[PDB]
């Protein structure tokens, strides 16, 4: 089965999202989610010696400006292994450009990592880890050649609002 | 393809069964199959610094008092990876009361582990091991503020009862 | 959906092919895609402390000698999980005779990362690391009293020249 297509986006869209990981924290293999089989596949090796500084994956039924779904972050202090559910609290979304595409990011905690409970905006995490997540991505397709663009950070109801429409996009783009 | 609903219970029931294991010894993430996709889950993160110490999951195409499959436990010296199949063999139970609802647990090896070849009932295990794993279950949900109760420790053939027992309760719920 | 009857061989065969892995490197267990569920089983654990020396997988929609798909071997640097696809270039082949069946395998490495961009051919791996890849074949079963013989390394050509007949076999096979 497909979960990019066949799994909602969420169980409480959006206070409460689905996402479906595709990197776990600490790697430098760029993993995604093959869209046509469900596998998981190896895009690329990062060129740089970087690892994911958060579990990283989609949203399902979600599509973006770059032509994938939407991208999400998830903080999780044991990392899950790759195609693992995580039911998710957007907190704040990173404002990116990448290669000339809107490419914003969902930050979000896990619901049920207690933790996390007080998380839940933007404030509420280190200064010093919104840089290390903007700096990965300012920095990670260098070698590649590809021109990224870290705007700032948006805050959770900036993201839930694109939560919505990259929701929206994904009824548009497959009918 | 769901392999809670479409593999079968074992190749040799009840003396061989397999295990599907959701969490890899080691990890303090629960893991779970959901069980109408087939995908993994993260049901929560356990709320204490404790570990899975052994790997655990379901039996398909069973059914249990909690309202789940039937849980197994696998002796594995390498930790598999979560939704591997393993032939696994019976060698005694775990008598668990979870929340007020019968929650007994198989404890099993792997057949195709030769470390294990001599294992064939409880007496095998040292004691020290089933403490460990009674201990886990008896503490593991205390700052969830749920009610867990270890009775003690089954032979081999009251596991393979038990596992009848539970591959007759998928039958009945969903046949 | 089952990968070994509907994932293509590869984009580009022969010159690009997919693996799907079913063993990270650094792995005693030997995990293996199961050709009729598709789902990931444990066929053993290695009888001895032995690790695959390679992502250890297979090609779709391939059929080999020994009525498996045609097995693969890909260089990683961080090893992927079990079921992850990856593009990847064979550089030649290990000819092994597994327990009376031809059971040859392709080495690969993969064409997303730049490391192995100059990585062509047999004469570019290392003497010592195709020498550990033999060696694991030559003994890994030795406890299981099961006899395999290592013969010999062929070329990315020779490689390339495998992989088609194991399509063919598989479209055989199967009345594909
Ligand atoms: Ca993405
Ligand atoms: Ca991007
Ligand atoms: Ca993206
Ligand atoms: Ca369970
Ligand atoms: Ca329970
Ligand atoms: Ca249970
Ligand atoms: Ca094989
Ligand atoms: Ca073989
Ligand atoms: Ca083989
Ligand atoms: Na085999």
């Known amino acids: 089965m497909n979960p990019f297509h066949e799994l ?3 169980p409480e869209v959006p206070e409460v999202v689905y996402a479906l990981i595709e ?3 600490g790697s430098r293999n760029k993993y995604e989610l093959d869209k046509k089989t469900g596998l998981l596949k190896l895009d690329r090796v990062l060129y740089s010696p970087f690892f994911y500084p958060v579990d990283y994956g989609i949203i ?3 599509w973006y400006d ?3 779904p939407f991208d999400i972050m998830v903080i999780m202090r044991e990392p899950v292994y790759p195609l693992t559910i995580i ?3 957007p907190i704040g979304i990173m404002k990116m450009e990448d ?3 809107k490419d914003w990011k969902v930050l979000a905690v896990p619901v049920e990592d207690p933790y996390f409970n007080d998380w839940k905006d933007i404030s509420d995490v280190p200064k010093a880890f919104l840089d290390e997540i903007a700096h990965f991505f300012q920095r990670y397709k260098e070698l590649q050649g590809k021109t990224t663009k870290i705007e700032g950070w948006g805050n959770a109801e900036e993201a839930k609002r694109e939560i919505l429409r990259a929701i929206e996009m994904y009824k548009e783009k497959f009918g």
């Open 60 to 62: 399902p039924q979600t």
């Open 66 to 68: 770059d032509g994938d």
């Open 99 to 101: 290669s000339g595409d």
């Open 8 to 10: 909602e986006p969420g």
């Open 87 to 89: 039911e998710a609290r």
């Open 23 to 25: 990197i776990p924290k």
